[PDB]
Amino acid sequence: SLALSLTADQMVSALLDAEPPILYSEYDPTRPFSEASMMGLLTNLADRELVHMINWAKRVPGFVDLTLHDQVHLLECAWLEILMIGLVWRSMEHPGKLLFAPNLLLDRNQGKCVEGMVEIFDMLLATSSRFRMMNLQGEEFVCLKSIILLNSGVYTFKDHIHRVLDKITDTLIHLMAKAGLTLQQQHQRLAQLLLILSHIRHMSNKGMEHLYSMKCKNVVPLSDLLLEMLDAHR
Amino acid sequence: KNSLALSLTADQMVSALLDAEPPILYSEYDPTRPFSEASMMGLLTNLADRELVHMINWAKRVPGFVDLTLHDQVHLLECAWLEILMIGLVWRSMEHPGKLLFAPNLLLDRNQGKCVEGMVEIFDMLLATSSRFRMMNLQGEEFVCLKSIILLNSGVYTFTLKSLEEKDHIHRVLDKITDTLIHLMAKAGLTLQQQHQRLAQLLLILSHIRHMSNKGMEHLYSMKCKNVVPLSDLLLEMLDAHR
Amino acid sequence: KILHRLLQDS
Amino acid sequence: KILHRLLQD
Ligand SMILES: O=S(=O)(Oc1ccc(Br)cc1)c1ccc(-c2ccc(O)cc2)c(-c2ccc(O)cc2)c1
Ligand SMILES: O=S(=O)(Oc1ccc(Br)cc1)c1ccc(-c2ccc(O)cc2)c(-c2ccc(O)cc2)c1
Numbered sequence: 001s002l003a004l005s006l007t008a009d010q011m012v013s014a015l016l017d018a019e020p021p022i023l024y025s026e027y028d029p030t031r032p033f034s035e036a037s038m039m040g041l042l043t044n045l046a047d048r049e050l051v052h053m054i055n056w057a058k059r060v061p062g063f064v065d066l067t068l069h070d071q072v073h074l075l076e077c078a079w080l081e082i083l084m085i086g087l088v089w090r091s092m093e094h095p096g097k098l099l100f101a102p103n104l105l106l107d108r109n110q111g112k113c114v115e116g117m118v119e120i121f122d123m124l125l126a127t128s129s130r131f132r133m134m135n136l137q138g139e140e141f142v143c144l145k146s147i148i149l150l151n152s153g154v155y156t157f158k159d160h161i162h163r164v165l166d167k168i169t170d171t172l173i174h175l176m177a178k179a180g181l182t183l184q185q186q187h188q189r190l191a192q193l194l195l196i197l198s199h200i201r202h203m204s205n206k207g208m209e210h211l212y213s214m215k216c217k218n219v220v221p222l223s224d225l226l227l228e229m230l231d232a233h234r
Numbered sequence: 235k236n237s238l239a240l241s242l243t244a245d246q247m248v249s250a251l252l253d254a255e256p257p258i259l260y261s262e263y264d265p266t267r268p269f270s271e272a273s274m275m276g277l278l279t280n281l282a283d284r285e286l287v288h289m290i291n292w293a294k295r296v297p298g299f300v301d302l303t304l305h306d307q308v309h310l311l312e313c314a315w316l317e318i319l320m321i322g323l324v325w326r327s328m329e330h331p332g333k334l335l336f337a338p339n340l341l342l343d344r345n346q347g348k349c350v351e352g353m354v355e356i357f358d359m360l361l362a363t364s365s366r367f368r369m370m371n372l373q374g375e376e377f378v379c380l381k382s383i384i385l386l387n388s389g390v391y392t393f394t395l396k397s398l399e400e401k402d403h404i405h406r407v408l409d410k411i412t413d414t415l416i417h418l419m420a421k422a423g424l425t426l427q428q429q430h431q432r433l434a435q436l437l438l439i440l441s442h443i444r445h446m447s448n449k450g451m452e453h454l455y456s457m458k459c460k461n462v463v464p465l466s467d468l469l470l471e472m473l474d475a476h477r
Numbered sequence: 478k479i480l481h482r483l484l485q486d487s
Numbered sequence: 488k489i490l491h492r493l494l495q496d
Binding site for chain 3: 287290291294304307308311312467468471472
């Protein structure tokens with residue numbers, strides 16, 4: 001492999017340059033949304049984000065080493081977690097609101113438009129507030145996102161993936177040591193960040209069941225790709 | 235006032251958690267009568283119902299948990315109870331590869347787990363988690379720390395103004411438990427690099443335990459509507475808190 | 478709630 | 488599956 005031979009700074013640089021772009025929602029001016037209106041904007045946005053995520057995943061150090069089947073399994077199991085942590089990250093500087101796109105900024109009142117969407121909306125807002133309180137850095141964010149990619153599906157098949165997960169762990173500590181944090185502050189912040197991944201997994205599972213209900217409710221026609229990523233969780 | 239949890243040392247933290255361990259309960263399993271979908275789930279629901287009583291009184295002995303209000307204690311247990319049952323199950327099953335030890339008299343493999351629809355996928359996840367604990371050589375001192383983390387962390391991001399001071403107390407206890415895990419790993423001769431990695435590996439498993447709990451919760455809710463398995467009044471209240 | 482009573486029981 | 492296409496092109 002070539003990911004284990006990278007230094008901590010070379011790991012950060014590779015993850016930062018592999019970052020997918022921030023896509024825009026469709027530019028309809030009707031900011032009062034309905035159930036089918038908002039779900040149409042979100043599925044369209046998420047479908048386009050999935051294409052960039054799949055190419056971002058290729059540029060994750062150590063991901064190309066896995067076989068095509070393992071790459072599929074990790075993406076299928078983690079894709080909504082990765083979308084949600086990206087949404088939470090870019091919603092930090094907008095307290096009380098979720099920035100799905102620069103032109104699609106929603107508050108919890110607009111979360112009532114979709115049935116059952118307020119519960120996970122509040123969880124997403126709380127995660128963003130948690131990131132803001134911790135003063136989460138983008139160098140830390142890309143490490144957490146790569147960890148979700150490699151970890152969320154690793155116990156549903158692994159030796160090489162755990163080697164990369166340890167390397168990302170070494171990278172996170174390197175970032176906290178570079179910021180002047182003490183040893184006790186280093187292992188505490190590492191634990192605080194990794195515990196949030198448990199909550200992100202929780203929001204994903206709740207979100208997956210929600211999208212599954214949107215399918216057989218047939219409020220908005222889902223794309224074939226989104227339907228295949230959704231099928232892998234049933 | 236002065237929280238007892240924040241005053242405890244690392245070794246005193248382990249001692250308190252070890253002393254608070256609930257017992258390993260037995261099931262009403264009879265090896266004479268073979269298994270089925272209704273009988274096996276009835277045994278598991280009966281077992282988990284009795285474990286819940288011990289878990290509730292175990293949570294009271296977790297440092298910092300009594301400092302929380304009654305409403306927050308209810309919420310944390312409602313959200314984490316299946317996670318705590320599952321990590322205890324996975325912990326019991328370390329020394330039994332390929333099998334899940336629900337009770338000392340109830341040891342099941344994945345072949346017998348097929349007797350319930352949808353029970354296979356989560357049976358393998360619990361097995362893989364137990365195998366993960368095995369090749370990590372997880373220690374009981376580390377296990378009681380992870381289990382207390384689940385109770386305090388799983389429902390902390392789903393709680394206003396005055397209640398925000400209660401979140402700061404939970405995160406203070408969580409940070410002390412992190413200090414405890416590091417203290418344990420340093421005593422075993424692990425380098426600073428090995429301590430960070432093992433700490434990360436342990437906490438990444440909690441993501442999978444949350445996932446198994448989410449899937450298990452959805453299986454128990456559908457089984458509630460199926461009426462084939464009678465659910466106890468306590469499990470029904472814990473189950474309604476998730477949907 | 479049963480969880481209320483069992484927590485209150487001292 | 489569609490995921491196999493994007494992972495190869
Ligand atoms: O299951 S949810 O909790 O349900 C809602 C729906 C509306 C509101 Br307002 C709040 C919750 C949730 C949440 C987030 C997303 C999503 C979409 C895009 C993205 O980049 C990140 C997350 C998505 C999502 C994910 C994939 C889709 O194709 C469409 C939407 C779903
Ligand atoms: O959703 S499951 O995945 O489904 C099954 C069912 C049978 C087999 Br064999 C395997 C899986 C699962 C798994 C584990 C439990 C359980 C029961 C007791 C316990 O102490 C810990 C976990 C439970 C559980 C939890 C609570 C209950 O009241 C009943 C069962 C459920």
